[PDB]
Amino acid sequence: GKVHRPRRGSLGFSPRKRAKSIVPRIRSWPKETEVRMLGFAGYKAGMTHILMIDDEPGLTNGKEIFMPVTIIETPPLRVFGIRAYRMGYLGLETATEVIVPDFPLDNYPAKERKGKPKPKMTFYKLLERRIATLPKNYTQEMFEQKLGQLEDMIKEGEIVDVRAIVATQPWVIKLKKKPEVMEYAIGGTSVEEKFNYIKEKLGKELRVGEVLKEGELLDVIAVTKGKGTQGPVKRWGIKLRAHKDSKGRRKVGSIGPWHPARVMWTVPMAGQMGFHHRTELNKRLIAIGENGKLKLDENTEIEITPKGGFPHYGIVRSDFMMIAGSVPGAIKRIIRVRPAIRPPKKKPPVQRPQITYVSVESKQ
Amino acid sequence: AKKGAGATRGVSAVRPTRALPVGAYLTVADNSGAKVIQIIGVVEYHGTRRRLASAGVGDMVVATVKKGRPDMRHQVVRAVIIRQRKEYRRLDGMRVKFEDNAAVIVTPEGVPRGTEIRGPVAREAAERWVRIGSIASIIV
Amino acid sequence: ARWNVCSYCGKPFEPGTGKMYVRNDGRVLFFCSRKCERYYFMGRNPRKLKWTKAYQEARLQRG
RNA sequence: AGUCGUCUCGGGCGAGAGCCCAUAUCGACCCCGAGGCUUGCUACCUCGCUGUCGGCUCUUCCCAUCCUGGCCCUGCAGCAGGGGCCAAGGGUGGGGGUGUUCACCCAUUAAAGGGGAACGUGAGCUGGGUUUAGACCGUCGUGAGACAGGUCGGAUGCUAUCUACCGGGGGUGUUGGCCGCCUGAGGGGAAGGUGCCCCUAGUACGAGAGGAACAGGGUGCCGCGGCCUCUGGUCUACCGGUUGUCCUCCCGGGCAUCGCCGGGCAGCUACGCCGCAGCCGAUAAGGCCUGAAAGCAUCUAAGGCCGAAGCGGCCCCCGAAAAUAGGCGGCCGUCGAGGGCUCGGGUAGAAGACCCGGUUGAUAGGGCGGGGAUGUAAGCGGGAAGGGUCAACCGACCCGCUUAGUCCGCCGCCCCUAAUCGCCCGAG
RNA sequence: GCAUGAAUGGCGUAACGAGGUCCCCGCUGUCCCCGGCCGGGGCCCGGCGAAACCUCUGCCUGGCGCGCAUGCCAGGGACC
RNA sequence: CCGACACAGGUGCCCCUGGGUGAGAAGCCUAAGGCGUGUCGGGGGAAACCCGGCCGAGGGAACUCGGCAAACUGGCCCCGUAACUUCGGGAGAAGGGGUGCCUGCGGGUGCGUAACCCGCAGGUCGCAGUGACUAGGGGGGCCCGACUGUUUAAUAAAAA
RNA sequence: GUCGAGGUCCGGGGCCCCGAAAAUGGACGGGGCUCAAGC
Numbered sequence A: 001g002k003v004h005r006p007r008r009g010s011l012g013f014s015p016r017k018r019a020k021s022i023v024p025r026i027r028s029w030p031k032e033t034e035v036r037m038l039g040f041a042g043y044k045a046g047m048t049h050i051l052m053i054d055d056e057p058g059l060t061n062g063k064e065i066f067m068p069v070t071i072i073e074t075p076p077l078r079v080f081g082i083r084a085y086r087m088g089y090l091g092l093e094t095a096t097e098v099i100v101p102d103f104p105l106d107n108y109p110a111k112e113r114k115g116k117p118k119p120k121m122t123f124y125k126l127l128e129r130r131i132a133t134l135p136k137n138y139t140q141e142m143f144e145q146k147l148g149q150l151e152d153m154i155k156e157g158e159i160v161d162v163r164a165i166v167a168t169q170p171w172v173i174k175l176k177k178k179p180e181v182m183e184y185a186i187g188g189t190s191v192e193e194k195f196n197y198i199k200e201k202l203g204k205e206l207r208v209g210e211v212l213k214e215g216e217l218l219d220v221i222a223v224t225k226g227k228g229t230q231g232p233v234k235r236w237g238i239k240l241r242a243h244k245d246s247k248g249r250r251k252v253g254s255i256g257p258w259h260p261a262r263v264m265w266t267v268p269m270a271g272q273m274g275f276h277h278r279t280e281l282n283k284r285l286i287a288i289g290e291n292g293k294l295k296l297d298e299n300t301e302i303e304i305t306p307k308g309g310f311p312h313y314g315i316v317r318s319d320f321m322m323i324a325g326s327v328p329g330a331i332k333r334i335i336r337v338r339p340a341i342r343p344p345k346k347k348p349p350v351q352r353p354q355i356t357y358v359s360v361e362s363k364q
Numbered sequence B: 001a002k003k004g005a006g007a008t009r010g011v012s013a014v015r016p017t018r019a020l021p022v023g024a025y026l027t028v029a030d031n032s033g034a035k036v037i038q039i040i041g042v043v044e045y046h047g048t049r050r051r052l053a054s055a056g057v058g059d060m061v062v063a064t065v066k067k068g069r070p071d072m073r074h075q076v077v078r079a080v081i082i083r084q085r086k087e088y089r090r091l092d093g094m095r096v097k098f099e100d101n102a103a104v105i106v107t108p109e110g111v112p113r114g115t116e117i118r119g120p121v122a123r124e125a126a127e128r129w130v131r132i133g134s135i136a137s138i139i140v
Numbered sequence C: 001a002r003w004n005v006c007s008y009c010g011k012p013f014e015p016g017t018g019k020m021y022v023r024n025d026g027r028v029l030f031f032c033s034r035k036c037e038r039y040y041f042m043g044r045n046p047r048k049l050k051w052t053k054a055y056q057e058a059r060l061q062r063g
Numbered sequence D: 001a002g003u004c005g006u007c008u009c010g011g012g013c014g015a016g017a018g019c020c021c022a023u024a025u026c027g028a029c030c031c032c033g034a035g036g037c038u039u040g041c042u043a044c045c046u047c048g049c050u051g052u053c054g055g056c057u058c059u060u061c062c063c064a065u066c067c068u069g070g071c072c073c074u075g076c077a078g079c080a081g082g083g084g085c086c087a088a089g090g091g092u093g094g095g096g097g098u099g100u101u102c103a104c105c106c107a108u109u110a111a112a113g114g115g116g117a118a119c120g121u122g123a124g125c126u127g128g129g130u131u132u133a134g135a136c137c138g139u140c141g142u143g144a145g146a147c148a149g150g151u152c153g154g155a156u157g158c159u160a161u162c163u164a165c166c167g168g169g170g171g172u173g174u175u176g177g178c179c180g181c182c183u184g185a186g187g188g189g190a191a192g193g194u195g196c197c198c199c200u201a202g203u204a205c206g207a208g209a210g211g212a213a214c215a216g217g218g219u220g221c222c223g224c225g226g227c228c229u230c231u232g233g234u235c236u237a238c239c240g241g242u243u244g245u246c247c248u249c250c251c252g253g254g255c256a257u258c259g260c261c262g263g264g265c266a267g268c269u270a271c272g273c274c275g276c277a278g279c280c281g282a283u284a285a286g287g288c289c290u291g292a293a294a295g296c297a298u299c300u301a302a303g304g305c306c307g308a309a310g311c312g313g314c315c316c317c318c319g320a321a322a323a324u325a326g327g328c329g330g331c332c333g334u335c336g337a338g339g340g341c342u343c344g345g346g347u348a349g350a351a352g353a354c355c356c357g358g359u360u361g362a363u364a365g366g367g368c369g370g371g372g373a374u375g376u377a378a379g380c381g382g383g384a385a386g387g388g389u390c391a392a393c394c395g396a397c398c399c400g401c402u403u404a405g406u407c408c409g410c411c412g413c414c415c416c417u418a419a420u421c422g423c424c425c426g427a428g
Numbered sequence E: 001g002c003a004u005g006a007a008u009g010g011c012g013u014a015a016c017g018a019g020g021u022c023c024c025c026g027c028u029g030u031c032c033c034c035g036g037c038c039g040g041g042g043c044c045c046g047g048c049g050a051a052a053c054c055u056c057u058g059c060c061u062g063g064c065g066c067g068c069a070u071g072c073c074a075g076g077g078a079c080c
Numbered sequence F: 001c002c003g004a005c006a007c008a009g010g011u012g013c014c015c016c017u018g019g020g021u022g023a024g025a026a027g028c029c030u031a032a033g034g035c036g037u038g039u040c041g042g043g044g045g046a047a048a049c050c051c052g053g054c055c056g057a058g059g060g061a062a063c064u065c066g067g068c069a070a071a072c073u074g075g076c077c078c079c080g081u082a083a084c085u086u087c088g089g090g091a092g093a094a095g096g097g098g099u100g101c102c103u104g105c106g107g108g109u110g111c112g113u114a115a116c117c118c119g120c121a122g123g124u125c126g127c128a129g130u131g132a133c134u135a136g137g138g139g140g141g142c143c144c145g146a147c148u149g150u151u152u153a154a155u156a157a158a159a160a
Numbered sequence G: 001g002u003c004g005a006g007g008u009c010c011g012g013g014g015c016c017c018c019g020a021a022a023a024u025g026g027a028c029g030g031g032g033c034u035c036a037a038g039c
Ligand SMILES: [Zn+2]
Pocket: C006, C007, C008, C009, C010, C011, C031, C032, C033, C036
């Protein structure tokens, strides 16, 4: 007989092409009864480690253990749109979408330069860097009529879902000015309840503390670090050819048999590696910190920023998340998180674990 | 419960790196009669195509005796690895490494053949094989 | 969560890093970095380097 | 290629062997087949060339199933065995001699299955065997010489025309143009597979020896997708030591693989670390209920309930060229929304493309500060084994000013400098 | 001794050999299992500027066929 | 000059060679002399892959027809050196220790405190002192041919 | 010995069923067809 072995690489992530957009998309949402927005967004900052008393079931329960964590900076999101979905012939179809009128912006870090007063920024100016075509002469009265029409459609019952359109605020943390516009689902079983939940916070700011719970599992969605064009040895993990090969060692030997008289798509080849849309499952949210600081035991507060700052990143100044393990993406990449969609049967308790040490030493 | 005091095997919370492949030479750290052994296999291990079986601290391997007493040479024995040169991480995150690659000859059930163990014995191996830790003089 | 002390430079290093070396006679050494470990094993004198805690003792002995 | 004598695999009958008992198991003598995986037979295609065996690399398929999932009979007490049924999602490994396929052997393992793809794969590799030209031995021949007899040596060419697959771009169409957010028709997945330990339990069973299972916990290995906090490798950025020579000597430099050696942050990596649902629905073998044909009986003829690692869904990746060529909000047209080149840089990169910034300014440089890497600079003062007219002076090296000096493909603050000017397309 | 043998020499042999062959210490990326770095190509821009080769063309599954079809039959799919 | 060429071949390297290190006409640096014409340039974290080179944790031939390739050793001085033997050899067998710089003495030849060479004592620095360069890995059986030498210019260097 | 209408056997004829396992995905020419669009 011959020798058997599993094939090189997985066919479940094909085509291995560049991501359609740098902003991740979410295809599936968890089913929940609590009325809350199902996820959040942030920017990847860096990695560090802690020592914590383990609370998850297993052999090392109750013993102090090492744990790598990733810090994700999450300035509050701006809720500025509401979208309604009806049931079409082949799936959900959006029926209407209402956004709030322009309002003054107060969290913009304006600075006095030589001459001229404060810039006095307003909304629809930062949003213009993403949309570029915003309503003109839009008034609170017209916004109220549109919201009333959407509500009337909900009462009639043509609407089967409602979602919240939010925008990031990188100018708060001084990362950049162009925001990311995303759509988020709201848990619950009542369309009216979801609509009221979105309406009460239209035009407002939402913080990660009001959304997510410490110690719960999450799914992390991002675009992985790009590697450019890579050969089959790195892309699919094939074996190097024999050292006596005079035509090269980092290539596939045979790319197919005589019949079929074509190259099958399953043969490993060089191509784009990295910068792929990926989803990671069951990452625990260790802790949530406010204003770049983490409280430990009601009398100690530490700065999560390591000495000298995060490598290739500034200083954390806003609310942040501590995610156990590693997350896909590069530094400053936009990261989306949602409640875990397939959690294990025996999940860890929904509370912050006992933390005994947090590393804040220089990471460069 | 079963095998209350007669148990021979234990559980360790730390999994040392498998840094000793097939064909490695280990020093026998007890007075069983053998001095140097060579790994020819690892039990409770499944490999893959063209992959050599590897083992680390606290692992039982099949070895052949290369140096020792004439009644022990050219014999196929079972040995538990107690010291390895390659560093491995513990629960607190610190790495630990030893001075040499040392093993203790035991029966297939885990009962040591010798009467005393010479040199330090790794904590992971000591908890994995209770009989070894009983006769070990230094545990680290 | 206890800071260990390097056996070469004499300084404390944070939990979760560093390494521990065990000699065949049971003595235990702690190394904060591969640099300190390599210097200790190659035999560089720690009493001549101003960045080592042993340098203070050496200078006290020399007066 | 045709054929199946032969080969591999089945079936019909039942002489019997099994303490009685043909069918738990083996099944004589005969008889009927399937496959094209052994060999042979024919000489139908190919001699103005279709490059061989074995091995390595890589992809895929069949079931006559080796293990994993579920069952039936037993001459099945348990632990195990023998025979058979459904089932191809996954696995089926490492070594010794030999060119070997095969076969034999070793230590593990759940098992270490048989085959097809031009005896898959030389415009992918290697060239050990075979099958030229050189040579030796044995045998045969008067001889030249020969041997499906051994033996040593004996070359592997390529700028891709079309198509194929992997990734990357410009267009047209989608009944006017543009920006943003979505839907998911269809395609792909193994994204998971499989051991062991504790307990049940020294319990059921069994005279004893021995010795389960449901449920409940823990963990290893193989496979897959990510990351650089820890560890390790590299680090021709950088820092230090040192040899030969040259720039006259000091400092500071060139060359000698980065001259060599030790350390080394960022980056890249693995030997490092993190993540990978068991539930629902219909079924195969099989176990049953009701029930007549056939007043009884009967799992089947009609009907009904359960029942697999197998099928469909939940999950993940691609996805408006999905020709029924989609939905919604907004801006624009019947001068003009929007965009491109140019500008400063990378969360990106072979060209394209993509992403941030562009005075609505901290994008890069520069200045200052933080953090880090080496390891205490030049200069001066002193000491130094000794020499020296035991004077002056020379002297490797050591101590103090000195956590110094040098450097940073990391961070923060400050508009001082450059992100300017300009050009072009564009629906009607 | 299928089928060795004594000048088509027999047996042995120190020294010698880029001859064939087996083993041991040491050594190592041959391998487990591959990962970094440097210089030259590859890639893009400005120039000089060919050749081998070429019936016309050129998507697949099952078939018929001089018995292994891009072009034939029935189906499938495919904008350039 | 010949090879169709402003051809990496051959004819002709045919005759000659300052300084330092060093046994050296070796390697490396450098003076004189010559050249930038072994003649297409520019860009780039601008990839995959190929050719040439450096390094690689733990293991150490488990790779493979076969340790192919690579790696170890390496100069000099002093101890020490086996089987066998044609007594010449094997042999640099094997194996072990040392090696820089500074200070000062002693010795050989020498008229010389000129030049070359050989020792001694002390001090001291580094992971490493033949620090770059130059520069053997070693041992034990068997077959064949005694040896040095010759051969199929263009697939066989051999036991022929 | 009680019910109280056809059962018992054999040899044949027509259609159908079991016997009936293969390798790129696929062959009644295809779609499909059941008092047929089969015999
Ligand atoms: Zn240290």
